[PDB]
Amino acid sequence: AAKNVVTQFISSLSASADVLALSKIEIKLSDIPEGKNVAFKWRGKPLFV
Amino acid sequence: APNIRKSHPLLKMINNSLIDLPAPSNISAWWNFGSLLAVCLMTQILTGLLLAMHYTADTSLAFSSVAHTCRNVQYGWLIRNLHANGASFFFICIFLHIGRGLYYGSYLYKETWNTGVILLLTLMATAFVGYVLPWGQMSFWGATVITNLFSAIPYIGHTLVEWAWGGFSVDNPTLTRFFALHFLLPFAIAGITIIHLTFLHESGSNNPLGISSDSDKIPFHPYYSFKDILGLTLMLTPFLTLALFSPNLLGDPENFTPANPLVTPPHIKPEWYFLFAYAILRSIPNKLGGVLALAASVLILFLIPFLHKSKQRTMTFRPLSQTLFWLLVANLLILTWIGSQPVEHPFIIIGQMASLSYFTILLILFPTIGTLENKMLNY
Amino acid sequence: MAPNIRKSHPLLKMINNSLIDLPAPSNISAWWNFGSLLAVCLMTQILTGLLLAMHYTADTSLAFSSVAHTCRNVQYGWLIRNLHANGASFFFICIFLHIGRGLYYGSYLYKETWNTGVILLLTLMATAFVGYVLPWGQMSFWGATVITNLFSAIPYIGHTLVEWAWGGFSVDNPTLTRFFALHFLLPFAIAGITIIHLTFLHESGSNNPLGISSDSDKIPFHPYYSFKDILGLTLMLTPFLTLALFSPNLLGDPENFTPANPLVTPPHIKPEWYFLFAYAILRSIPNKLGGVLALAASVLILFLIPFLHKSKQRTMTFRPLSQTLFWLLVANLLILTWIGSQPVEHPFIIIGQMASLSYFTILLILFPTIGTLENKMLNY
Amino acid sequence: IHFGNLARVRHIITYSLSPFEQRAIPNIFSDALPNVWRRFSSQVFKVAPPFLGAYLLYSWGTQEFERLKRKNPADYEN
Amino acid sequence: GIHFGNLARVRHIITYSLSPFEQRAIPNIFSDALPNVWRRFSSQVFKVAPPFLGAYLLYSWGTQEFERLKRKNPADYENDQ
Amino acid sequence: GELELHPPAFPWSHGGPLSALDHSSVRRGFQVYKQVCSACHSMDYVAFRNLIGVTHTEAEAKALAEEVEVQDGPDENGELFMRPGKISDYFPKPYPNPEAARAANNGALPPDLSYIVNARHGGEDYVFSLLTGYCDPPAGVVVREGLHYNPYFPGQAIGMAPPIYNEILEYDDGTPATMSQIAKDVCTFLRWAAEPEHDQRKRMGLKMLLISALLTSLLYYMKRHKWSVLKSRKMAYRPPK
Amino acid sequence: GELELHPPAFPWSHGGPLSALDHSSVRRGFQVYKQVCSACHSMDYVAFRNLIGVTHTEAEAKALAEEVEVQDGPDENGELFMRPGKISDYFPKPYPNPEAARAANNGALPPDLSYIVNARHGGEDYVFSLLTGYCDPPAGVVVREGLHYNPYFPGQAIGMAPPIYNEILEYDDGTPATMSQIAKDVCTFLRWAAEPEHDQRKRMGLKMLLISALLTSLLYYMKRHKWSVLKSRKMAYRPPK
Amino acid sequence: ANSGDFGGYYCPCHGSHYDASGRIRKGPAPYNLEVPTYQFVGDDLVVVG
Ligand code: HEC
Ligand code: HEC
Ligand code: HEM
Ligand code: HEM
Ligand code: HEM
Ligand code: HEM
């Protein structure tokens, strides 16, 4: 009983369903000249393309 | 000192309150609610923190942050059920603890008793501000009714209410401050519990026969540690059964609807543990009068120790008082029931009856019968 | 039982035995004033904190502005915020001097009082950290990023713990709401552990500047130290209020007046002054895990002090060589503090590693060594 | 710390057995249940009564409330 | 908790004190106080001051050195064209 | 005045303490919400991903989401644009705000249905009785224009016209789309929408009961075991005499 | 590469520890913000009511607010509508989002100015030096198209063209609108915008200093008084025979 | 964006240098900038996630 209750409570602090819901983002390669670096926020962190 | 359990400045304290503590050999199940109340407190705090870590105190986000908790947080729904129902379990246990106290005249330990009442008052405030947080229709209006009670105070009344609100009505500043209070109060309860048990150890426990147990004491461990752990699991079954098989038996469906400042629910009814008091508040058709009756209905507890006329401590050997005692309990059931009904015949009259008898049993019959019983014993 | 309530009552009895009839050394100096000042910061912080908490809103979209709302709309909200922000600093100034006094006078020989003392420091640190993150400005965010990512240096479980603590893949809203709750809670653990601190302490009562038994000359806490303490309170209260009322932003980073931006990191991320010396140490080791350990050790080294005492005398009052070594250490800390506020570049980098290296050298080698050396010069 | 200074006791002997030499729940039928009945019996007419009364007041008041919701045909006779 | 009365075994020591009302709160400021403040200061300056003086120097240097390295070195463009 | 008719208790296959929800029924119920109720009712708290592994497969869920156009942005010009739905999106709101909603329902506001079975006394029993219980007003009772008589709705005059009737849609699983069949399914769906944890909660309750039975017994013994010492203890008073 | 020019310290009339803000200057400063800076800079945290009793009369403040059209609603149809401003409204944002802002400023984002003097090292000293310090780049330095050389801005190439020049506006109080005069005022205004409590804070600081001087002295005496007992205490060791 | 003695990236916090490929060349940084898993709309779009 202790192992379960403590496990449940512990996990209540790890990524919730909405957060784990992860998608993909499309980026057109015609908006970035040759040499440029564009940053796109994504899954919390910055996405470098 | 030869053994650490006694010399160490910290263990010394654990030993003197949970290991070598002298306890009466004959205390019954009615002496189990003290520890159960302690566990509710630890349980409530622990589940409350876990909920607070996903809660958001803002009228535009309160309701949904709770929804977010129950729907997205791993075991969020479970933790919420345990918290919401734990509050009920807390009141069930506090009421039985109180009953035991009145029956066995535990109130003759005045300081333990008085702090006991402070604890009750504090638990009430806690439950109240906590109940308002989810911000449903019931949370909102209950918060409206309750806070407006204080407006009944003459002169300073309107001023205090608007102050407490942080504006002209229950609104966001009320919610944010209520969250803070709800977070803080439980810890005052924990602290005052220490004072409660500190006064108590000055004399140790009372017992069912109401006669000195110095001739027959036993170490708290393992007698009551084991008995207490047993009592824990016994009460833990209904709690979990309720929370896991009937999560919403005790709640008003109205609180599943976002608070609406413009529409008041048709039948505003408080949580079960406040019904009997609500009933009393309504018995007096006068605003201020009804508030005083409500205040007195709880503060009457500070008066109990002074209405003790019996030459005996408990009611164990007092058959007339025992009847008077169960009448009072039943009287409370009636009030509870009356508090859940609308203000209409026959309820209105039944209510005023029960209200009137409640105070009559405590202020007149109990001391009177106690004196009468003394004479029948030839004292 | 007893003729006077001050002694018989079960609650007053406690106040009497710790703040009225408590036997205190007749000669303790101003350095013994920081205990009570620390207690007053604690009560002051809690009070101002609740008051701020009543208008705060833990949500990334509302954090920054709720604080702004507090300073701009709440009657005296601005004042209460200044008192809270600056109170955190006075809290560290006082804890640092409290520790300094402890090391100098060998107060650490009261091992339990000392150890709980270190737990108190650690807890205060956590508290200040989660608290600093709440306003959610640029510095709140990135500092929260740097600090939390320190834990990712732990091998194997590192990444796992960090993402757990975050409640997601980076510092975000669930980090903020859980940080608020922690910030609300911890101060009370501090208060509780303070009781344990003073409880262990009373087992022996205070030490004193000469480091010799004061049983021959003790005096009631009241009115000697109650009056002395209230005086010390108002003396430190002036700078505090002067700073808060005439220079509210002397200690903060202007960067925190800019809403956190996940995509732009400030050019010069610099921690609050009370964390600079440690930060300096963290950077001395150009290796992620190595730097983290140096940082951990820089504080946990305090648990080791009681075992590095070789002197036959308790304090440093009659030990001139240790006194030098002592001020070297203090100055070493200044250097680290200064180094922690500069960019990682020559000559700072080398100066930094020097200071870091000597910090540990003074504590682990010179102090016990010199202590032994001094014993011999006394012919012991 | 109270054991040792509780009471002044004389000439009382007590006998006990290790918990391993005895039965945890002995004489259930010859002693336990008979006593549960004894206890129940000695209290039922003290407790039950007021609760019975509360129950009645409840039944009545409830039925009366619903009865007053019904239509009185004598209001539309003419 | 309660300690006065069981602290130490003391013998043959007499002490004399006056009520706070029979005496001056801050007496002999010039004949005693300040002279002693000076004594105290003096007996510690060469213990404390030194390391701080050194910290100050290291600070001055390191700061100046940092800024110096920001300056331009004319010998990097002498033969530039 | 305050005359009210309370719904009967239907034997839902998820009413028992260990009775899960009928997922086939929940899947169907979803279609009813999607094809009928969503035209006027929002369900703010449920997203297309919630369907996965419950009533639909991931592939299906994605499809369902892409059928919807959702607003996003701002883009580079600071403009809002439309895009196809993602499983992480919540069910589309029929209106931008209650004002618009009322405006499209004669001043009446169709409530969000995420927690409707818990926000009404009677739960699905009440939602089912209301959906299948429309009828003409009794003698002496006149319903104002725009409202419809329903004995189950408080006041009896509801602003919602009977939403479902036979074959108003076709279950792609071949179930005979009768009015009551439809109500029964959507109601089941509503139960799930309100407490997605329903099933897991009951599986836990089962374990809770078993562990509790066991543990309570063992602890009872242990308490009795230790206390046997005092329970069977005997004593006597032997004064010198 | 690591070169930067730091602004000098101007003798602002509000720099002294007991120096209030010059309200005439703050009033003027506001006009500069309203008529010049607000075209690209937002000031999200200040409302027209904040002006009252500080720089403007209630009647004036109301006028100022009504000059703006603000969005409100939804109305009866769930539609958003426009209305004239109220003193309770905050200053109008020039753009709907930073994307639009950048879009209208060559990819550059003009920051909100509510806390700008506190969000930049140097405060008004820096804002003043930047506004009046534009000049041509030094030999060997080329500014990319769209940027302007400013030695005070880090990197020295700013995306903001010199916003103010002589007589770019007329102070209705007749003050000679010279560039530096305008900068000095708007900067004073910015100080106020960032810390509206500026003045009150300093008045409190005054009292704090007095009460503190007094209280510290009295408590110093009391401590000395009580301790005089031990301070002048004498003792001797008189062992027997 | 485009800073560091390797024409790639430079971290202002403690001075970690990365090349135009995102690899760690100089500084405290233990590994190279993560390469997210990136389905393929031929040419003109990139589905990352
Ligand atoms: C044309 C729009 C429309 C459709 C389609 C519709 N509803 Fe409604 N619904 C309403 C309106 C309008 C109300 C408001 C009734 C009132 O308060 O007067 C309402 C109210 C309700 C209520 C109960 C309100 C209460 O106070 O108890 C429920 C439950 C409900 N609808 C369920 C459904 C379900 C399930 C469906 C699909 C089978 C459905 N509705 C389809 C318009 C609609
Ligand atoms: C045509 C739009 C426009 C006008 C008008 C304007 N600004 Fe700006 N301002 C900007 C832009 C764009 C930036 C961005 C500069 C950058 O980051 O490259 C900026 C930046 C600033 C900054 C400093 C940014 C920094 O990082 O240090 C301040 C301060 C500022 N402006 C003040 C003012 C004041 C005061 C006025 C009115 C006297 C004003 N601006 C009017 C466009 C303008
Ligand atoms: C937060 C609420 C409370 C907690 C945690 C608590 C806890 C305890 C504990 C652990 C005990 C010892 C064991 C027992 O006899 O039950 C106790 C005893 C007692 N408490 Fe409380 N209590 C609470 C509330 C109250 C209240 C509301 C009253 C009275 C209005 C009260 C009156 C007493 C008294 C008089 C006793 C003496 C028991 C005896 O007769 O031996 N308590 N309580
Ligand atoms: C004496 C112990 C406590 C009692 C009696 C209590 C009671 C309650 C009540 C009545 C509710 C409403 C439940 C509902 O939603 O229906 C509530 C809500 C809440 N409580 Fe407590 N609580 C206690 C302690 C705590 C503590 C210590 C915290 C936090 C550190 C806390 C945090 C919360 C939060 C965040 C909610 C809102 C979420 C929710 O409504 O489920 N509570 N509490
Ligand atoms: C929340 C933090 C703290 C509070 C509130 C606090 C409070 C106190 C109090 C009131 C005293 C008695 C008066 C005095 O001598 O100053 C004391 C003494 C002491 N504290 Fe703390 N303390 C804190 C932190 C610490 C720390 C960080 C250490 C050590 C790492 C520490 C070590 C001690 C020791 C050893 C003494 C003995 C003093 C003597 O030599 O007589 N304390 N503390
Ligand atoms: C040990 C005592 C405490 C310390 C060291 C402390 C420290 C801090 C720090 C460093 C900040 C950030 C200040 C800033 O805005 O720059 C902060 C913020 C905050 N603290 Fe505390 N705090 C303490 C106790 C509390 C308590 C008890 C509460 C609440 C019951 C609290 C509530 C807050 C709130 C709401 C903020 C956000 C508003 C703001 O940033 O000004 N604090 N605290």
Ligand SMILES: C[C@@]1(c2ccc(Oc3ccccc3)cc2)OC(=O)N(Nc2ccccc2)C1=O
């Ligand atoms: C949980 C509850 C509650 C808890 C304790 C109470 O006791 C009091 C607390 C403070 C002041 C007076 C009574 C009262 C209500 O809080 C709350 O909003 N309600 N709901 C409610 C509904 C209608 C009228 C009055 C209240 C409670 O029952």
Ligand SMILES: C[C@@]1(c2ccc(Oc3ccccc3)cc2)OC(=O)N(Nc2ccccc2)C1=O
């Ligand atoms: C106030 C401050 C802080 C306080 C106590 C600390 O001590 C620790 C607390 C927990 C864990 C490790 C250290 C560290 C930082 O919180 C915070 O975000 N910062 N800012 C910061 C900036 C750059 C790097 C690291 C931190 C602090 O200084």
Ligand SMILES: CCCCCCCCO[C@@H]1O[C@H](CO)[C@@H](O)[C@H](O)[C@H]1O
């Ligand atoms: C005394 C009461 C003890 C309660 C023990 C019951 C343990 C709950 O068991 C739970 O069952 C869920 C459903 O399968 C799982 O998803 C959880 O991970 C598991 O911990």
Ligand SMILES: CCCCCCCCO[C@@H]1O[C@H](CO)[C@@H](O)[C@H](O)[C@H]1O
């Ligand atoms: C890396 C380890 C991954 C383990 C995935 C944990 C998935 C938890 O799965 C759980 O199973 C229970 C029993 O079927 C269900 O009742 C819960 O709703 C479900 O979330």
Ligand SMILES: CCCCCCCCO[C@@H]1O[C@H](CO)[C@@H](O)[C@H](O)[C@H]1O
């Ligand atoms: C910085 C802009 C200041 C404008 C107000 C001038 C009055 C300053 O003065 C102070 O203002 C406070 C708040 O208004 C009052 O509470 C104080 O009593 C008052 O003395």
Ligand SMILES: CCCCCCCCO[C@@H]1O[C@H](CO)[C@@H](O)[C@H](O)[C@H]1O
């Ligand atoms: C040692 C602590 C001394 C605190 C005394 C400071 C009292 C300042 O008092 C404040 O002065 C302001 C200036 O007009 C007023 O606006 C405030 O209302 C008033 O409370």
